[PDB]
Write a protein that binds this ligand. Structure first.
Ligand SMILES: [Zn+2]
Length: 334
């Protein structure tokens, strides 16, 4: 009928998922998914207004149309699908290279291993991660997030420089999963034509200690940027340092240089706009949250809001606060 693709989520590997995603460009495509005895249809389309550069190659984002509540990522090295199953947010991860896939599976086995992590094999085909479960097992829930220091229509291109900490362990698909959440949180600025967003992912030779204090870590990050010849003259963009782990002995997931410091018309220079962020699947919206702060958003008391003041599993990657919208709109115009 209006079906264009079939996909068995249990048996699929990279070529299956990429085979589907690479054919989706301008129009909505309808896909029949199967997981065990459950078969259902969903529709997705490519996301416009965003560009991702990873190893000097494009990465593409996809999303469900309406109530579909599905996202996907297509890279030349991996692909992912994120959707809701039985009320849980589920990540399906496929890497093109079998060795890399094995390394990725080992990561999830060592860090989470009722089934939070499922590995489908023939030789691993894909990895299925229950994000909701993974979040539910995290500590510090309810504790106040402490992630910033105390005190236009063109469409303007906003480019985020995402810098991978050396030996930081950030996984390729985690970075673009974090980016997807940023993209969702900023849709209201993108669909309206206020901005287009570019995410530039780069390796660095900048290392950090595991338990380091966030303020020192950020400053150390910025000092590295200022003498890094690879980014010479690109000092007027937001820079975020990415690691798989955390700061301050597990208590800090991200930290922004300031609130409301990104301005499209008169951008700050000398790498003054920066943040650090985990990329861990256990903290899927942390990058979007930090960038929220950089754009002017403040903590709020709505637990569904991206900018919720406390760590909770109810958080969605959406700015639901009208006041934060006001703050962000006023900030970027400066
Ligand atoms: Zn915060």
């Amino acid at each position: 009928p209006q079906l264009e693709h079939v996909l068995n989520l249990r048996s699929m590997d990279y070529e299956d998922l990429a085979g589907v995603l690479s054919k989706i460009s301008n129009t909505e495509h309808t896909i029949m998914l199967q997981e065990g005895s459950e078969l259902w249809t969903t529709s997705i389309k490519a996301i416009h207004g965003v560009e991702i550069e990873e190893s000097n190659r494009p990465v593409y984002l996809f999303e469900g149309q309406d109530k579909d509540s599905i996202n996907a990522i297509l890279s030349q090295s991996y692909a992912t699908i994120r959707l809701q199953r039985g009320g849980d947010l589920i990540d399906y991860i496929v890497y093109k290279d079998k060795e890399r896939m094995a390394e990725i599976a080992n990561y999830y086995q060592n860090h989470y291993l009722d089934k939070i992590v499922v590995c489908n094999t023939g030789d691993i085909k894909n990895i299925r991660i229950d994000i909701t479960k993974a979040i539910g097992n995290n500590p510090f829930k309810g504790l106040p997030i402490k992630d910033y220091p105390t005190e236009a229509t063109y469409p303007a291109t906003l480019e985020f420089m995402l810098i991978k900490e050396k030996d930081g362990g950030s996984l390729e698909h985690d970075i673009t999963s974090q980016i997807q959440a940023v993209t969702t949180s900023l849709k209201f600025l993108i669909d309206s034509g206020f901005i287009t967003v570019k995410y530039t992912i780069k390796d660095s030779s900048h290392k950090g200690g595991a338990s380091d204090y966030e303020v020192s870590a950020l400053e150390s990050f910025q000092n590295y940027l200022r003498s890094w010849d690879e980014v010479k003259g690109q000092d007027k963009k937001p820079y975020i340092l990415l690691r798989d782990g955390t700061w301050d002995s597990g208590k800090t997931f991200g930290y922004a240089s300031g609130i409301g410091v990104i301005h499209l018309n008169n951008p700050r220079g000398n790498f003054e706009v920066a943040a650090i962020s985990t990329t861990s699947s256990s903290h899927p919206y942390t990058l979007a949250h930090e960038i929220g702060h950089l754009l002017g958003a403040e903590h709020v008391d709505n637990e569904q809001d991206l900018m919720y003041t406390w760590y909770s599993p109810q958080v969605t990657p959406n700015h639901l606060s009208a006041d934060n919208w006001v703050r962000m709109l006023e900030c970027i115009q400066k």
